[PDB]
Design a protein around this ligand. Structure first.
Ligand SMILES: CC(=O)N[C@@H]1[C@@H](O)[C@H](O)[C@@H](CO)O[C@H]1O
Ligand SMILES: CC(=O)N[C@@H]1[C@@H](O)[C@H](O)[C@@H](CO)O[C@H]1O
Lengths: 141, 141
């Protein structure tokens, strides 16, 4: 099994984001999202699956942060500028069907950042980036 | 918009279930799962969508409880004896393509119960079953 423990950092007082969806993809015997000490903990049955957290702010901004393991190496991606019909479960499935998402997963990134249309930065950084007990920061700008 | 507020009653000390996935379907401008006063709150953009909570117990038992609005009336369904590849997001999507799930949704039930292979009962009952501010108990046997 693989575990990814996620700590969320919010740095900008002009918004407040909160989790509104948490999904687990069906490969590698699935998995579970739970909470321990205010951290989001994804446990997966083996290498080859992932889970997505969707966040929403009062001002209408939203994004997904997806975490997984591909051929025993961690990966992550952020999708911003979400339309109302781009829920977390829609995005999570796309990592195994849609070319640009698949390629993001295949990059096996220990860190990734992107800006939305409003210019806000979002970053994931794995602070424990190897082995079966993985830890990442999600930093919202 | 439609809101469904869910209170979880665990009645049997021989197991302990906790939520491990919370998904939102893409129709009707999607929606959001949040928590207020230990209650799971689903808000949806209009009629025609739903959200799934998956629960897991440390003895290996699990189930999905899905809540939504179909043709302006609440619906619910429970799926248990889940295979490892039947995550919450898998089940949630099935309500919009798999005929038996579609039919369960279209029944617009305000009350439903079912047993798993171990003989445990699971029940959803809407205590406020009318209008746009809906309230349900999820009762674990
Ligand atoms: C601006 C933005 O969010 N771009 C995302 C990018 O971060 C992601 O790597 C890619 C593939 O999933 O999808 C894009 O929509
Ligand atoms: C034992 C069990 O979970 N049976 C479920 C039933 O409750 C549900 O109405 C139906 C359609 O979704 O799918 C079955 O697998």
């Amino acid at each position: 099994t693989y575990k990814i423990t996620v700590r969320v950092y919010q740095t900008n007082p002009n918004a407040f984001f909160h989790p509104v969806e948490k999904t687990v993809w069906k490969y590698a015997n699935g998995g579970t999202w739970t909470i321990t000490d205010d951290q989001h903990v994804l446990t997966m049955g083996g290498s080859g699956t992932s889970g997505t957290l969707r966040f929403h702010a009062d001002n209408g901004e939203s994004f997904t942060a997806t975490f997984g393991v591909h051929n025993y190496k961690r990966w992550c991606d952020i999708v911003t500028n979400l339309a109302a019909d781009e829920t977390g479960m829609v995005i999570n499935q796309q990592y195994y069907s849609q070319k640009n998402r698949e390629e993001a997963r295949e990059r096996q990134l220990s860190n990734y950042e992107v800006k939305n249309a409003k210019g806000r930065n979002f970053e994931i950084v794995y602070t424990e980036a190897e082995g079966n007990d993985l830890h990442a920061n999600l930093i919202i700008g």
